[PDB]
Symmetry: none
């Protein structure tokens, strides 16, 4: 019938969904671990890029 | 003549790729803005003087 019934398309949509949730889950946990009694001062490291705002070319 | 030649499959793979990169971008931006509003803002204010170390004269 007209009913699609695409198996692959169904898997691709399912895979991605979990993929996005996985990638993040890893990033979130990573930050926490590096946060739990771990001062990396990442703020300053990223702040060095702020100078670009007050560092024109001419 | 061609191996696959699947237009949809090509779009699904392209969409996801950008999708994952998009979601993250939003998460990263949020955190930053969530840190800039930290009670330790004073740190940054004083950090602006650090540039003097990497700001030599002609």
């Amino acid at each position: 019938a007209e009913q699609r019934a695409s198996p692959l398309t169904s898997i691709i949509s399912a895979v991605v969904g979990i993929l996005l949730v996985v990638v993040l889950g890893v990033v979130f946990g990573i930050l926490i671990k590096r946060r739990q009694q771990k001062i990396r001062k990442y703020t300053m490291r990223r702040l060095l890029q702020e100078t670009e705002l007050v560092e024109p070319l001419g």
